[PDB]
Amino acid sequence: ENLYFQSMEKYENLGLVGEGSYGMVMKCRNKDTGRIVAIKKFLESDDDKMVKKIAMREIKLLKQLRHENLVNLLEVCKKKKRWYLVFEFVDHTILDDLELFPNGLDYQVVQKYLFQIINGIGFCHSHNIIHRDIKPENILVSQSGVVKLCDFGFARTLVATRWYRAPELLVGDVKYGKAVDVWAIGCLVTEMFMGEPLFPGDSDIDQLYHIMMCLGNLIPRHQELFNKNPVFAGVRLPEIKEREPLERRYPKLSEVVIDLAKKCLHIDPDKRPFCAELLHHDFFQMDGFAERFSQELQLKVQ
Ligand SMILES: CC(C)CS(=O)(=O)NCc1cccc(-c2ccc3c(NC(=O)C4CC4)n[nH]c3c2)c1
Numbered sequence: 422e423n424l425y426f427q428s429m430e431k432y433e434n435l436g437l438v439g440e441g442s443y444g445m446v447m448k449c450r451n452k453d454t455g456r457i458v459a460i461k462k463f464l465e466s467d468d469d470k471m472v473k474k475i476a477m478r479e480i481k482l483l484k485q486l487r488h489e490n491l492v493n494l495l496e497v498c499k500k501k502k503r504w505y506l507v508f509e510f511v512d513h514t515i516l517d518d519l520e521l522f523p524n525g526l527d528y529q530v531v532q533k534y535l536f537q538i539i540n541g542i543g544f545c546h547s548h549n550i551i552h553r554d555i556k557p558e559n560i561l562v563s564q565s566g567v568v569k570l571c572d573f574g575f576a577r578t579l580v581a582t583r584w585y586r587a588p589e590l591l592v593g594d595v596k597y598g599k600a601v602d603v604w605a606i607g608c609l610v611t612e613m614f615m616g617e618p619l620f621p622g623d624s625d626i627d628q629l630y631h632i633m634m635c636l637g638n639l640i641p642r643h644q645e646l647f648n649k650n651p652v653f654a655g656v657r658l659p660e661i662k663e664r665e666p667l668e669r670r671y672p673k674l675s676e677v678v679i680d681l682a683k684k685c686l687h688i689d690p691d692k693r694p695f696c697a698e699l700l701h702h703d704f705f706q707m708d709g710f711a712e713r714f715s716q717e718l719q720l721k722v723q
């Protein structure tokens with residue numbers, strides 16, 4: 422179809438990005454233009470016509486996912502029978518800012534970051550794409566403060582921190598949906614403002630304890646799935662008789678912020694707001710921040 426390959430000869434491999442965290446993604450310099458890029462091996466051999474078919478479907482989708490708040494595909498290169506995808510390289514993550522401000526970020530800074538994260542995730546959701554692994558490491562930040570989300574999870578293409586995982590993911594619900602990303606965003610609301618993870622569990626069951634001692638008992642579906650899931654070895658969930666609400670843990674946080682977080686962190690995934698509804702929240706709409714920042718975000722056009 423419409424897919425033409427560039428050359429790997431112009432790139433110099435400077436090493437793996439993020440000390441190898443995101444896998445075999447190579448930080449590369451384009452020796453023709455000086456641009457720095459992120460290159461991932463994509464296909465081991467285009468000799469297999471079936472693997473080739475699947476690969477071109479994915480490239481077609483990656484091209485449709487061009488957005489100011491996503492790491493974008495720049496080109497595809499071919500070396501021998503291998504394919505490589507070239508994406509943008511972004512220098513910093515939101516971790517760098519959290520490390521500078523360990524007692525919480527500035528209010529407007531959180532507005533700008535969350536607006537962009539929700540904008541980027543909402544765009545993917547409109548293409549029926551779920552990230553499923555939002556965390557500070559995957560939220561890149563350009564020198565200009567433009568957020569670029571990276572490492573989305575793609576279906577039909579075929580240890581890790583659990584702090585941002587929704588209850589449906591923890592209990593093994595295969596009917597999870599876009600609401601898992603909204604849960605992850607709600608986890609980031611309090612983290613950015615307070616300088617500490619909301620639910621820093623060290624196992625799936627420990628993560629569930631963190632969540633429910635704050636937010637209460639799970640919906641019936643998730644308790645039943647938990648009881649059937651063999652990874653929990655017949656163990657049973659705790660019964661919450663007096664949760665500790667977010668505003669009790671963080672009594673200084675504004676009502677508007679606690680409302681935003683509570684909505685994203687609804688125990689029932691179906692009662693969480695969509696990403697678009699999140700941008701209409703008072704947190705973003707008060708004093709016309711959304712209008713102003715939306716036009717301000719024309720630093721995307723350099
Ligand atoms: C959005 C769309 C749906 C495509 S995708 O994001 O889902 N797939 C492409 C993909 C897959 C896996 C990893 C990456 C990746 C990771 C990191 C960076 C980066 N900076 C850094 O690591 C700095 C040291 C912190 N610059 N560029 C990157 C790219 C990208």
Ligand SMILES: [Cl-]
Pocket residue numbers: 635636665666667668683
């Ligand atoms: Cl609460």
